[PDB]
Subunit: 433 residues, 4 copies
């Protein structure tokens, strides 16, 4: 059964309970909500329906909120500081890369440029200032209400748009914490050369990364974009942080109930690079065939996961422990690695080595039972309490057999923290069911 | 410099010497002649031109003749107008080549469309535009049921999943194209729609009848039968062309990457070339820049491990053909750059050619000089993805051109090589001459010695 | 500090408390009681002196009772006068125990001497002093030709190299000695002349009979038959004593090293103690420094991988016992200090314990703390030759004592460990208080959880 | 069968063509002439005797000159009677070679005794028989306190544990020995008591002045100074002899094995021969079979990786010199048999030669044919302990001689090789001819090509 997770952007064609239950069945794991449209009571109801389908069925799913972030769209440009922040020689581009201009003069409220290439300029096009740094907040007074709605509803993840550096992340995170959303994970969307160059620092600040290669492409040389993707997936796998692969996934399916062979290859290679999750935007949100897309997407995942291997080859404790747990599991042919988590780090720590076995992750934490839904190959499980290391062993032996994920006489490797604080994974323990 | 080779389909937009020189200058290595169109006088000239440029410049290049192969076409419609088909509708295929079609029925060029197809099977028209499962067969008719909405034009292609189409390996015309190619002396022949071992042997027997015994046969796997017979098809051929677009029509979508990755992997093991072909930078037929999706697709096939990536319409008829070769070259360069050598029943040649590459690497040699007759040893070194350029010395002119298709090899025609010490002596003179290395560079040299041409058996480390 | 354990034979010149305490200081770990000698009253006070030194000092040692064994000896000569035998002469052994021998004939204590032997067989008398070849077995006579000049004394040992001897597993006195062994509650019994599995089973039965079921049987391999059946013998035993001198008078000399190395290796694999025993520092029976060659042979046996090295008469009855222990122990520390862990069907215990050592090494842990009931999981950890010391906590005393014989384990006896977390709390307390580790140090802790005695399943890492 | 080589000391009881011939049959590879004994006529005849046997049989051997070397000895006693020294007594050595001593004073041969020694230093006399500690040095007297009881005889050896002695590199008769050594064209010279690089540089200059520039210098490491300077000594030597007995009287016991194994390790890595030399089978001087412990000591020295193992008194002045060679050789065959290649700063020869052994093993080659001018490539391929035999081809007869000492090489003097292919051609003729390999065997062939003497840069695989 598939291991990599499917994020499905849900809008009004798909928000019903009956569809949401269908889409969970087809392999949806996370509802993405893209607040570049809609009204709050609509969205608020879109959440409740999923949360109803969840009670009604026993399925887990996570909720992820998208923020739009900063934009810049003789023509008239939205951004008043355009003239300040641009510089002589700079390369402006309009309409996702279509026309490139080089800045010759800026006088007053005017950036006068020389057009470098032919193109048909229209209404409301994108302006990209590659290199150039923009003084717009990561999170402007306008998208901030989106966030607050998000904390209020208690979404699991926030994907933040147009992240260019550490500071940006920290400013999304200081917002959330101002409103009770401190336990909400931030996924940073690298959509530009600046964010790209600042990735390692964007990565230490965030909880994950959304690889938006479409957006990124506009800004950097084509022959660099896959390599950006691969690097960022690899850097995320190492850090133990979720990474979604997001843009241009199965786009044809907004018009067709079957994907291009080049889309499928492109989704399969991202999974092979090592993602946690693959994303469906309009295919599930606006298009004519949303349940078709989730289902083909799920067969691509399943077919791809199932040929992939484990990945075992200062040195840290959690790293030694969790690498041994997976090495030992596969050695002993265990179907499962059963893990105790508070905030998820150690289910994430095990997953980093791409286990054959399923991670069944026991938490008493609700947010982290949901959040873990976005981690590759992980099945979260909310438990009432784990009182001791032997209790954990005893409980997880019950839930493993009970899970149907293993049977009597199966070997199961159990991973947890014992006499340590939350941050750490420190003991591994093999058991026969 | 780029190690993977670029095969460019030359058309009349590119066939000139001044444009062919530019293409060799942007990074084209192999000229593909698509005999699904054109004529012998034209292709004859396209050949002479390249041979002229290669003479004019001193560049090397290979010439690949692509066969059109067996097809099933639907034929003509009433008044030559497209008809609109619709789901659940009965449609019917007729074997009568003079029945003109409408939205109820067409005729198909293939006389055994019934004799072969079977009640229940899938029929797809215009490269999978329209799908249809069979519900009956009677007489000269395949009575079908239409599964989705489309418009049927005239003369469309028919893809018959599963159906062992008993069409022959060589078309009526295909034989005369092959004969043209033997006469012209082309280096490779890429043969379309290879379903089994016997299909290969039928092209090889054809070429052998005509002085083509030394021509390499690149089999195009374009359907499920060919896939299922890959290992045997590969034992029989000299290389493989992965046709992704074609296979995409023929097999489930989630299988194609894996059909590609699987075929490239086995080609490398077999020491035979592999071209990754359809659906590369097709957008560049209208656009002077590629998709991010396209440049990505290309990079992943180089990373999978191809020898060569192929330009079709983008260099044959597209509006921006020199741009394709250049961005296709920068993608190559960029990708090879970050690739590693892969070193981790005995075979003497595997043994020495793996050592010689592992040593090159440890000693930081710029070059591996290899001595070949038919290219095997240079192909056997290439199998471990050396960092080092393989400079391969031949006295055989054909295998000198043929070798231009292999990854990161640079062929060089030499007068004779008289002995093992002479090889070492001559290859150092040419290694310095090549500008691929310099004084005090180490150079591993690979060759056979007191052995027949099959075998590569000795290696030698030299400081220039 | 040294990791390989020293077994010291205790006799009357070193049996005192003051001396026992010095030797414990020098490196003694195990007191061997050789029952070739002494009475039960002596060995009893011997055992008592050591127990009082352990009381008074908190040192732990073990007590290993070494049987004398069944034997074939020659018996009494005319007048008690040694005789000189000549190369080539005839000589006869007689099963007849009444015959007072001379220059032509002796009696041997073994009734089955004619049965066991064969024409062509070699008989060695007095530690291979004299050899002879069997020329005819007639009646109660074995008639031989003398292979070399030598002097026969009374009551000499006989070795039948290559021959199976149907002597019993235990001499009569041996059975009477073993019950004393049970009474006294010794930790080990080393059983002499072990030839086959059945011998070991017998011995186990005997001890089991007298409440001695927790006493470990160390099988002494002293000849070819025993070497032949070593695997099935090691299976039935708790460990092995490699008696090199005996093997050297029984099997070809060039074989004895590989006998030693094979048996230490299979003991390590089976997770069972091995003692390297005879001919260690015998020169120190007379001198206060060992030979160069003596020092090398001990060192090589530790590098082979023994748990323990043995002193015999040079700590029991020699003139420099305390110097023997000391230099023995300096060879020990010197050799241990340069050995490496050994990390490279699959079981749970082996998987866990090898992860324990491997992780310990990676994380620079001074200590691996194990909780044992019967000693196994300390021995399972010891198999990989860790750099860390193994603190092994038991509530079981006999095992706390037997674990003293195991390479580089520091046993220690505890009230109780109630749970797995209790274990990790307890072992950190004792790890710090042991002075083996200090605050900041990592400590890998190994145990069994929700499993019965047999099994080591879990492992935790902690910083002190 | 065996690969490790045997140096045998030839003395009176063994010097005859009949004897030497059986010696060679039994395992002898090198004749050691020990120049602590015997006039030049004697050694001259032994030299001739051996060269006769070789000629008359086609056998190869080498001849090695073992210098006596510089010494400190005690001198003459009153009336020439042994004096018994008592522990705690005062005892003085005098630099006055006029004095005739007794139980309180002796003269020594060494004038620098007083200089080199220090209060607190240990003096040993008669191979460690009596030890003493310096209490004061006054004038030409080193006043001591005797450490243990013993009879000092006359003309006894003195060892100064850990003291740098400024005796010269060479004794006066040593120089005259080395000149005879040159006239005789011996193949090696094992120089005695080598303690710093400058000593070797001297011995080399002496041989060079007498036309012995082709003679290899084996440095004997006999004390702590030699050991601390072993890296630069090894570097200026062609090889090493480990004098264990002497190291035993000079450095801490527990340290001697390690000194051995270190020095064997470093000679392997350096591609220079190493001989393990003293106290191997000394018991066999009086006895026809060796000791268990002696057998073990030889086997371990072989597993450490020696080229050669040395006999002394056993073959020179023993009772059973041919018994000794035989069991030594059985010990060799038996141990060599169970050892493995060692495959697992970036240089050419090391790469080619590792690859060759590496390739030979993969392909199971019985044989590696090497072409050598001064033996280096034989010694380079030997470094990895190939399973295969090295058949080493030279036109140089000295190296064909010296290569006799290298582990598992079979020297072959050939009339020429004119090219690399000429090599490959001849190496198969000889490989088949040699009975070592047979039709169908793989044979790996290693040489230099387009390179001067120093370098091994080409390897080739051939089927016979």
């Amino acid at each position: 059964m598939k291991k990599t997770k499917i994020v499905c952007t849900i809008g009004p064609k798909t928000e019903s309970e009956e569809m949401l239950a269908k889409m969970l069945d087809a392999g949806m794991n996370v509802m993405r909500l893209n607040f570049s449209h809609g009204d709050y009571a609509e969205h608020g109801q879109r959440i409740q329906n999923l949360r109803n389908v969840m009670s009604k069925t026993g399925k887990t799913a996570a909720i992820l909120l998208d923020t739009k972030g900063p934009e810049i769209r003789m023509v008239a440009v939205t951004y008043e500081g355009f003239t300040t922040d641009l510089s002589v020689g700079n390369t402006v581009l309009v309409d996702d890369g279509l026309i490139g201009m080089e800045v010759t003069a800026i006088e007053g409220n005017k950036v006068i440029c020389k057009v470098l290439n032919n193109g048909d300029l229209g209404e409301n096009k994108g302006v990209n200032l590659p290199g150039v740094s923009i003084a717009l907040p990561a999170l402007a007074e306008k998208d901030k209400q989106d966030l607050i709605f998000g904390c209020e509803q208690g979404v699991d993840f926030v994907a933040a748009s147009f992240i260019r550096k550490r500071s940006d992340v920290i400013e999304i995170r200081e917002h959330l914490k101002a409103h009770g959303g401190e336990n909400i994970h931030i996924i940073s969307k690298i959509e530009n050369q600046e964010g790209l160059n600042n990735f390692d620092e964007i990565l230490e600040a965030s909880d994950g990364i959304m690889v938006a290669r479409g957006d990124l492409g506009v800004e950097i040389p084509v022959e660099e974009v896959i390599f950006a993707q691969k690097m960022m997936i690899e850097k995320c796998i190492r850090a133990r942080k979720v990474v979604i692969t997001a843009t241009m996934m199965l786009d044809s399916m907004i018009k067709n109930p079957r994907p291009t062979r080049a889309e499928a290859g492109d989704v399969a290679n991202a999974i092979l690079d090592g993602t946690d999750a693959v994303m469906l935007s309009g295919e599930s949100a606006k298009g004519k065939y949303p349940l078709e897309a989730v289902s083909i997407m799920a067969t691509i995942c399943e077919r791809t996961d199932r040929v992939m291997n484990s990945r075992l080859e200062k040195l840290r404790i959690t790293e030694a422990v969790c690498r041994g747990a997976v090495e030992t599991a596969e050695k002993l042919d265990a179907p499962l690695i059963v893990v105790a988590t508070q905030g998820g780090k150690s289910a994430r720590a095990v997953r980093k080595y791409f286990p054959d076995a399923t991670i069944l992750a026991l938490t008493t934490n609700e947010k982290t039972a949901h959040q873990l839904v976005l981690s590759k190959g992980v099945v979260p499980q909310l438990v009432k309490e784990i009182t001791s290391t032997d209790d954990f062993y005893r409980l997880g032996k019950e839930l493993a057999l009970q899970s149907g994920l293993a049977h009597k006489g199966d070997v199961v490797v159990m991973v947890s923290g014992a006499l340590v604080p939350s941050g750490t994974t420190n003991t591994a323990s093999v058991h026969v069911l």
